[PDB]
Amino acid sequence: MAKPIIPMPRSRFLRVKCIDCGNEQIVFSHPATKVRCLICGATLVEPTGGKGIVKAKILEVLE
Amino acid sequence: TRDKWKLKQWYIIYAPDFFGGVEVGLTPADDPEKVLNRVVEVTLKDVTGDFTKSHVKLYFQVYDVKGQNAYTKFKGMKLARSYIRSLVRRKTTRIDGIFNITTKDGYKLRVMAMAIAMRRIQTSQERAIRKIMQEIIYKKAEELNFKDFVLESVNGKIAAEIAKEAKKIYPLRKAEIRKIKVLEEPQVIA
Amino acid sequence: QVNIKKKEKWGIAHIYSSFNNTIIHITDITGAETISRWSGGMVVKADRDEPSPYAAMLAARRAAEEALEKGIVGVHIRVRAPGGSKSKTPGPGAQAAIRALARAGLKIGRVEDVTPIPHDGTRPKGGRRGRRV
RNA sequence: GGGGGACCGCCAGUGGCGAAGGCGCCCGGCUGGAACGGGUCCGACGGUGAGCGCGGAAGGCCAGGGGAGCGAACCGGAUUAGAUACCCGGGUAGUCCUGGCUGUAAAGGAUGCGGGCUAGGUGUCGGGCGAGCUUCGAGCUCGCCCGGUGCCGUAGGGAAGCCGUUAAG
RNA sequence: UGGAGGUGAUUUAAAUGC
């Protein structure tokens, strides 16, 4: 890693735009849990190992 | 003892309920009616491909004898030490897969299958290959007749159907029917 | 005799293979009738020659005249040995019997690994430093 | 053909798990630990640990139940100069189960625990990641990373054997 | 090229000497 030369996680941010309601959500590239859309009740991502596996096609802007 | 030989009777094996009267098997014995349950081993020359090739040794049992003619059912299968040692390898796995069967005919049948694993990553998918056998088998027994269901298993048909499903899960190699044993005969109504 | 269609008889031959003795024992295909039983210490006078190959050809030749006497011309050989008690590996009568059948003229079908081999453990004798020499 | 008790070869690995003793048929329920990605929460709560407390193979002991094979003692044979043995044939306690006691070992890695620092290489197990392959399952492989488990070896240490990012620096 | 296991093992070779 870089524990003595400043450890920075692997992370990033990405704007996810829902395909069922057009709802714009901020999502941590590593979903630990099931993230639920706040105006669909859908599942955007499912938590597995490392980076949450995104369920099916949902739009993405990478920050 | 001190048979002329003339206290020696002869019978002949006709073994159906997997095929027709397989003429193969000839029986000498001393007195009348000391074989009525005696067990005969055969390679089976009915299908000269697989049933002669990789299916060496099946046990058949004379349930009855009539007019001096032996009527023989499927009692069992067993493979030789030849088979089981040969196939197995290291840094992989060998698996074994029971199921206590009930077919709709009123026969129960104990199977043990044996598959050999594709190399690394031994895991819970092993027992899930186990699970996908006992699930599929139960369902084929309930649907199929028993006499048929003892032709299929002994043939490679079962080893073949098992593989298709189980290669989706976690790819296998060298899957078979190691042994089969007739759990319960009687009927659906005794 | 109730009419025979094949005109060939078959007698499976169990071969029990010890380093203390050799036993050859051919029966009918069922196994329910014993034509003949002949070992390697009727042939001889002494314990040392009880096994060897030479008893394990002669034993397998006296029997072979009585199987010819019934009609048994084809023979399957089922090689086996004491497995749980001792070591499974066959002794000097295994290469011997098959040579004793090719000379007798009885045909040789299947030759078979059917020796008792436990799927498991049972404690034999011999411990601390196992059996000692 | 029937009955009984023990155990689970190959699998099986230079493999895994466990604090340790230790642990291995398959299936399910209950349950301990552990890895990793994200540090999301607490905000020094830490280390070690005399006394103290707890777990601890086999053997032995206690009470009850069980007993195939095996087998101290023991009973025969051989061997042998003699044999209280090696080898062979019988054989009780015990070995198994339940409850309790006992608390020992070359209980070893003969290496107390915790933190930081100090060339590397390779194999391997599990987890992550970027790809190619795909039977579309991380199934077959390449590399970086994290945790563990071996071997080889630079600097150094050592009396030497050896140890050497799993330290004996 | 050097290291670790798993099991055959071999009785045909005799006690002692200040």
Segment 5-44 of chain C within 8 Å of chain B by CB: 5-6, 9-10, 12, 28-33
Structure tokens at B118: 């594709």
> Residue A37 in contact with residue A21, Cβ under 8 Å?
yes
Report d(CA B30, CA B176) in Å as an integer.
Answer: 40
- Per-residue 3-state assignment (H helix, E strand, C coil) for chain B: CCCCCCCEEEEEEEECCCCCCECCCEEEEECCCCCCCCEEEECCCCCCCHHHHCCCCEEEEEEEECCCCEEEEEEEEECCHHHHHHHCCCCCCECCEEEEEECCCCCEEEEEEEEEECCCCCCHHHHHHHHHHHHHHHHHHHHCCHHHHHHHHHCCHHHHHHHHHHHHHCCEEEEEEEEEEEEECCCCCC
Whether the CB of C131 is less than 7 Å away from nucleic strand E comes out as yes
Report d(CA C21, CA C50) in Å as an integer.
Answer: 5
- The residue of chain B nearest to residue C78, with distances taken between CA atoms, is B80
DSSP single-letter state for residue A22: -
Judged by DSSP in three states, C90 sits in coil
CB count within 10 Å of CB C109 equals: 13
The residue type at B134: Q
Name the residue among C1, C30, C112 with its Cβ closest to that of B40: C30
| Method for structure elucidation | cryo-EM
Whether the CB of C20 is less than 7 Å away from nucleic strand E comes out as no
Least Cα distance to A16 among A6, A34, A29, A5 occurs for: A29
Question: How long is the CA C122 to C1' D63 vector, in angstroms?
Answer: 30
Chain C positions in Cβ-Cβ contact with residue B56 (cut-off 8 Å):
110
DSSP single-letter state for residue C9: E
DSSP single-letter state for residue A29: S
Query: To one decimal place, what's the resolution in Å?
Result: 5.3
Give the CA dihedral C56, B40, B112, B46, nearest 10 degrees: 110
Give the CA dihedral B72, C1, C106, C98, nearest 10 degrees: 40
For C56-86, b/e burial (b = at least 16 CB within 10 A) is bbbbbbebbeebeebbbebbbbbbbbeeeee
Least Cα distance to B113 among B162, B31, B189, B177 occurs for: B177
> Residue C19 in contact with residue B16, Cβ under 8 Å?
no
> Residue B60 in contact with residue B78, Cβ under 8 Å?
no
DSSP single-letter state for residue C23: E
- Residue to test with chain B: of C2, C30, C66, most B Cβ within 10 A: C30
